Each structure stands twice: as C-alpha cells, then as structure tokens.
Amino acid sequence: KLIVPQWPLPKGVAACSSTRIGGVSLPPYDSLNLGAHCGDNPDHVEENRKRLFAAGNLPSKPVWLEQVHGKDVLKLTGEPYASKRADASYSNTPGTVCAVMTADCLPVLFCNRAGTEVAAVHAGWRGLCAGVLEETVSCFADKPENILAWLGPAIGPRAFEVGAEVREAFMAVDAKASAAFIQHGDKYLADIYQLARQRLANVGVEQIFGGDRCTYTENETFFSYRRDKTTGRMASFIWLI
C-alpha cells in the first residue's frame, strides 16, 4: 500500500510515498525495501522497485541521488549527470521523477499550484539545519506563496532523541527553534516537523501538509534506522505529469 499525500494536488502534478508493505524482501528488509545499499538481496530490491513504480504509476524511473546528508539540490535538467551528489532534486520537466530515499529522515515534497515545478528533499537534521529547504524553495521560479509542501513520514517528536549540540546548532540560525526541543536526560527529544515548518514560514511557504506519522512508532508500516539499525528504505516521489 502507498501513502498518497493529503494536500490539494494541482492538475499536472502527482505524488506518492512508500511503506514497508507489499514487497518481496526478507527480514530485516521485509518487505518493500527500495534501498540498494543496506545489504538486501539485489534481486529483491529490483523487484520492489518495479512493484512500487507500477503501484505509483510513475511515468519513468526515479532519478535516485547520491544522498550525503548535505543541503545541495540537483536540478533535473538532463539524463546523463555530472554528479548526483545531492539531498534534494528540482524538476520543471514533465515525466521526470523527483525521488528521495529515507528511513527516519524527513522527506519533503514541493510543487506549485500552477503545476509546473516540483521538488523532493531528503532533510536529515544537518541538511535541515544548514538550509536544504530554503535552498530548494529558492530553486522555484514561482513565489513561495504559491508553493505547497508535504511533510513525509519521519521519526517523530516522541522518538527523535538528539544531543545538546544539535539543539544548539538550530538555535544559532533561528532562535525560535527552542520550542521544537524538549529536555530528556542529557539529551532532547526533537520535533523535526516543527523545525521544518519554522524554516518554511521564514521563507514564505504557508501551505504545509502531512507531518502526522512516525517511522519509529509505526513499525508495521515503516522501516526506521534508529529502531532497526539494519533495515530497509522507503522513498517519496513527485513528478509533473
């Protein structure tokens, strides 16, 4: 089964986010593991990808990134790439699939109401803190007012334990980050949805959706790196039809 973002989806845009359900992989990758570098059977991963691309009605294969937990955006201008080293992608080309691979990190999908540009972001805390979302938004020709954002399944505020330094880093950029951390031993529990919403507001994006799942809690629906260590991967996808 496939998560369909609950937002006012514009006419020529289409989106989906995968779960752990309905694949072919064996534990600890059971069953719809999309990740090719976490030690799964390579023929199973290939099979899960095929089923998910069918289930999601993707028009072409996703442009998978070399995700490095940074803040760079690849503009999906053309099929042979000089380097896919990026944690976000941007497209204004019909049929081109933006894709981001996650199991705890925040997926964010963007599109404009006019339905002429899309973006997908893999926003781990470091990339989020350093401004991956602001950098993705800045790629859009449209104005932020016209931009929709969907917050995908990520590790939620009851499970995302971070060190004092992480909380420190977020407040160094934007002091109101403080409300997104709650003390918990020598650490804090952090609300990644709250932090993403703050960055998005600071940049003018007001139509924000999703943010109601937790990859760590919902173990029957999602892989979680923090929970499992060795485990599968989900992905979120957006494209212009």
Report the C-alpha gap between 224 and 153 in whole angstroms.
10
| Interface mask toward Zn ion for 142-181; x: CB under 5 A | --------------x-xx----------------------
**Residue 2 binds: one of Zn ion, its own copies, none (C-beta under 5 to 8 A by kind):** none
Q: Does 187 bind its own copies (CB under 8 A)?
A: no
Candidates 58, 105, 137, 235; binder of Zn ion (CB under 5 A) is 105
CB of 196 to its own copies, least distance (A): 19
Query: How do the residues of the chain divide into helix, strand and coil, expressed in percent and rounded to 5?
Result: 25, 30, 45
Q: Does 132 bind its own copies (CB under 8 A)?
A: no
CB of 192 to its own copies, least distance (A): 15
CA count, 13 A, side-chain hemisphere, 36: 8
Q: Which of residues 23-82 bind its own copies (CB under 8 A)?
A: 27, 30-31, 37-39, 68-70
Element (H, E) at 121: strand 118-123
The closest of 188, 184, 186, 197 to 167, measured between CA atoms, is: 188
Element (H, E) at 169: helix 164-173
Residue placing its CB nearer to its own copies in the complex, 6 or 57: 6
Q: No. of H helices and E strands in the chain?
A: 6, 14
Interface residues with Zn ion (CB under 5 A) are: 36, 105, 124, 156, 158-159, 214, 216-217
